[PDB]
Amino acid sequence: AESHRLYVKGKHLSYQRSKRVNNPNVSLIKIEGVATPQDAQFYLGKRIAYVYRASKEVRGSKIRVMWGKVTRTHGNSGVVRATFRNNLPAKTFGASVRIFLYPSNI
C-alpha cells in the first residue's frame, strides 16, 4: 500500500575517470547500504534504470527512461561500475538510479 518498490535506490556518482581523462561509458553507481565488494557481487548484472520526466509527451507519458547493467565492482566502498545503452548524461551526476532485481540468481 505504501511501497511498490521492487528496486534498490542507488545514486549516479561519476564516469570512471582518472585525475584527467574521463571515459563516459562507465558510469559509477553507489547503491544503498552496500559497503563492500562482497555485498556488491550480488548486484552484478542486474538491470539498472535511470528515470526522469522530460518536457514533451512521447508515448502517452512524459516519463522517460534509460536502461543498463551493473558490470563489476569499483574499489571497496561498493561503488559499482555500470554501462547503459545510451550513456548517462553527466548533468545527472548525483542523481537517483533505480537498480532492479531481475535477473535473479536467487
Binding site: 511498490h4 534498490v8 547500504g33 552496500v34 550480488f42 532485481l101 531481475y102 535477473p103 535473479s104 536467487i106
Partner: protein, 151 residues
C-alpha cells in the same frame, strides 16, 4: 525448395551446437512460492507448478487468490522463496508449449483454471496465513538490503 537459387548465397558451415535441456537453479522444486519481478503481475506471490519445453515455468497464483491466471514465466524474472506447498495432488501434464498459441477470453482456458485452483486451495488452507500471504504484494521496505535478505 523446388525453386533453384536465383542468387548465389553460400550455405552455412555444419554448426556444432546441440540444444541441451536447461538445468534450473537449486531452489526451484515444483510447488514453490515465487515473487514475480517483472510483468503485469510484478510483485505478486505465485506458485510454481511445472518446468517447460521452452525453458520457461508454468505458474498460477492461483487465480482465485491473487488474480494470477495459469501463466508461463521466465526463470530469471522470479525470486524463489523457501516456502513450499504440496503440489503432487495437481494434474499439470495437460499444459505444454502448444497450450499457449493465439493464431473475449477462451471458455476452455477458464475451465482448466478452476480444476487446478480447487485442487490447490485445499493445500494452501492447511498452513496458517498462506491464503493471506499469497493475496498480498511483495515489496522492499526502507532498510531491506537485498544482499542481506533471505527468501
Amino acid at each position: 525448395p523446388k525453386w533453384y537459387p536465383s542468387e548465389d548465397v553460400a550455405a552455412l558451415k555444419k554448426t556444432r551446437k546441440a540444444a541441451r535441456p536447461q538445468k534450473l537453479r537449486a531452489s526451484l522444486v515444483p510447488g514453490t512460492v515465487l515473487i514475480l519481478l517483472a510483468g503485469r503481475f510484478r510483485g505478486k506471490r505465485v506458485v510454481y507448478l511445472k518446468h517447460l519445453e521452452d525453458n520457461t515455468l508454468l505458474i498460477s497464483g492461483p487465480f482465485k487468490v491473487n488474480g494470477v491466471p495459469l501463466r508461463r514465466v521466465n526463470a530469471r524474472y522470479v525470486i524463489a522463496t523457501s516456502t513450499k506447498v504440496s503440489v503432487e495432488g495437481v494434474n499439470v501434464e495437460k499444459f505444454n508449449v502448444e497450450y499457449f498459441a493465439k493464431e473475449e477470453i477462451k471458455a476452455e482456458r477458464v475451465e482448466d483454471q478452476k480444476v487446478v485452483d480447487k485442487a490447490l486451495i485445499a493445500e494452501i488452507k492447511k498452513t496458517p496465513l498462506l491464503k493471506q500471504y499469497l493475496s498480498a504484494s511483495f515489496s522492499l521496505k526502507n532498510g531491506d538490503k537485498p544482499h542481506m535478505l533471505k527468501f
